[PDB]
């Protein structure tokens, strides 16, 4: 067929080869585990003798020849174009059966695995192909487990190809198993293989799942919900202050988290939007919240350094005044009475805004919300109103968890369903058209 002869005149025993490959795999099937010790030993001896006879007659080379002449066609469609359509259908199955037969022939046989070293270089060259990757990997694992000569011949190029298999095909634990077998075999460690695997896999930090310890971060908010809408009885400018009575820079190996600013909700739901209830996320870690840690402006988990006189991280006895302008979307900060040369602008105003502070363990902060809920240390900028003026006449202002679940006994924990939309937050007087 490769000599471009006619497909009809040439005979290709597809069905016979498939049935013989199934029968051959059944012949070289390993003993099952539930069998008794004597029967298992007899079956193992029979399998070993069969493998030795096949290797002495050189059937491994015949299988490799069939595999090589089948790999010249890149796809089942190509094989059905050259040969018959039934051959194209059976091409993948025949390749899988041949690779399984090779694995069965060389599995557990030290002599066969040692003789397959010469062909190991030929084997790895086709690891990238998707129609044979699993079989080639199984054969490679079977050879590496048994033969140390395999590890001796394996080199940096083969190791890099094996790692590129993870890079291109995704996470597969069998490739990690092959890499583990590449390091230590029969209690002897190959330091060159260890160094190559380390230096070619670890520094990237792009394939293996990275791991870290993150301090738990919680957020606290007042009751007030601030929004802007057309024809609504709501003041567009608001102002509040935060008192930092105490903060420890390093309560643990990770730096203490302390961010202050404004956050918004998704739509009119009272539940804060865009963020997760628990974790290491705080103010400014999503596009729904806007924060200031004393040195950077936080929004969408991206921090930009903002200038300020004697700029520093939020320390003890620091006054942070946050201003929110809803007429023109703008959030500005002033630390210790000095303006912060940076502001958030042109954000989404189709929602309800509220003051928020995010922190890890090791803080002691105080909300100054104006009026009798905190006395302002500095005069509000002209026009801005204290946040205590946003409380509804019947409701009472209080500072609670931004998220609905907190630390308490499990059987006393109040499981909460979806809350109703807070449509009455914005009072739009709609007269009946007459």
């Amino acid at each position: 067929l490769s000599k471009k002869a006619k497909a009809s005149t040439v005979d290709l025993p597809i069905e016979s080869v498939s049935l013989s490959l199934q029968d051959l795999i059944g012949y070289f099937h390993p003993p099952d585990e539930h069998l008794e010790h004597e029967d298992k030993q007899n079956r193992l001896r029979a399998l070993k003798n069969r493998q030795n006879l096949f290797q002495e007659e050189g059937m491994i080379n015949l299988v490799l020849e069939c595999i090589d002449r089948l790999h010249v066609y890149s796809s089942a469609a190509h094989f059905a174009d050259v040969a018959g359509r039934e051959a194209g259908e059976s091409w993948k199955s025949i390749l899988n059966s041949l690779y399984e037969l090779l694995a069965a022939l060389i599995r557990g046989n030290r002599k066969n695995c040692a003789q397959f070293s010469g062909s190991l270089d030929w084997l790895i060259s086709r690891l990238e192909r998707l129609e044979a990757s699993s079989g080639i990997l199984e054969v490679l694992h079977c050879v590496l487990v048994e033969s140390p000569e395999a590890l001796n011949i394996i080199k940096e190029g083969h190791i890099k190809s094996i790692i590129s298999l993870l890079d291109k095909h995704g996470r597969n634990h069998k490739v990690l198993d092959v890499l583990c077998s590449l390091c230590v075999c029969h209690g002897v460690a190959v330091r060159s293989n260890q160094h190559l695997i380390c230096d070619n896999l670890l520094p990237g930090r792009d394939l293996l799942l990275q791991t870290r310890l993150v301090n738990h971060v919680s957020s606290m908010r007042p009751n007030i919900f601030l929004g802007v809408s057309e024809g609504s009885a709501q003041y567009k400018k608001w102002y509040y202050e935060l008192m930092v009575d105490h903060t420890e820079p390093f309560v643990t190996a990770e730096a203490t988290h302390l961010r202050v600013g404004w956050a918004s909700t998704e739509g009119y739901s009272p539940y804060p939007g865009g963020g997760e209830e628990w974790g290491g996320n705080g103010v400014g870690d999503d596009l729904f919240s806007y924060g200031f840690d004393g040195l950077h402006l936080w929004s969408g988990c991206i921090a930009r350094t903002v200038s300020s006189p004697n700029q520093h991280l939020l320390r003890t006895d620091d006054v942070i005044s946050c201003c929110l302008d809803l007429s023109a979307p703008s959030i500005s900060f002033r630390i210790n009475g000095q303006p912060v040369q940076g502001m958030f602008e042109n954000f989404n105003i189709d929602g309800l805004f509220f003051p928020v502070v995010s922190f890890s363990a090791g803080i002691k902060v105080r909300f100054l919300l104006g009026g009798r809920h905190g006395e302002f240390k500095f005069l509000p900028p002209p026009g801005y109103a204290p946040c205590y003026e946003a409380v509804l006449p019947k409701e009472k202002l209080k500072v609670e968890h931004s998220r609905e679940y907190k630390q308490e006994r499990t059987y006393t924990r109040d499981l909460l369903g979806p809350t109703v939309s807070l449509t009455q937050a914005a009072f739009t007087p709609i007269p009946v058209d007459t």
């Binding site: 010790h37 004597e38 030993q41 193992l44 001896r45 070993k48």
Partner: protein, 186 residues
């Protein structure tokens, strides 16, 4: 459980019978337990015979004869401490022409059609040592020049007298009592 562990180890596939310290220790312990050794009464002689039979039953009821046959078969005709301990244990359980042990040993061999057992027996016989004039003369010369002897027994001459005697005593006990079946089987 210990005898079954030894039997499974002997029945497992190896190219060579590896020396097992646990086996050399426990085979010796079992062999000593099975024998535990001037005119004496007939009742005393019968009590000794019954105690010997009970001690041997304590082992061959748990599969000691099959295990000592399996170890010899797996030896593949290589003389060693494992084979010596196995032969001593077999002699201990076969002392007195024990008919139950003889029947168990013959039945196991007939059922399993074990050719390796007899091949290893022939190999062990071929490996048994004899008197060596060359070694004896070299030792005598070494004493004549007066070098200190590392061992005074001259064990290089007649390397394993105890092993040869145990190997042939095992086969004699295998046929004690005019056991025609096993006599023909050998």
């Amino acid at each position: 459980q210990l005898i079954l562990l030894f039997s499974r180890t002997a029945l497992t596939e190896k190219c060579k019978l590896e020396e097992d310290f646990l086996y050399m220790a426990y085979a010796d312990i079992m062999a000593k337990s099975c024998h535990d050794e001037e005119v004496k009464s007939f009742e005393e002689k019968e009590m000794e015979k019954q105690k010997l039979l009970y001690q041997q039953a304590r082992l061959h009821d748990r599969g000691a004869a099959e295990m000592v046959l399996q170890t010899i078969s797996a030896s593949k005709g290589e003389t060693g401490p494992m084979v010596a301990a196995t032969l001593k244990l077999g002699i201990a359980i076969l002392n007195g022409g024990n008919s139950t042990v003889q029947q168990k040993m013959l039945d196991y061999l007939k059922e399993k059609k074990d050719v390796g057992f007899f091949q290893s027996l022939a190999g062990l016989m071929q490996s048994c040592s004899v008197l060596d004039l060359n070694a004896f003369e070299r030792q005598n010369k070494a004493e004549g020049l007066g070098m200190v002897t590392e061992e005074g027994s001259g064990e290089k001459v007649l390397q394993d007298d105890e092993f040869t005697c145990d190997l042939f005593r095992f086969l004699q006990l295998l046929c004690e009592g005019h056991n025609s079946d096993f006599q023909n089987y050998l």
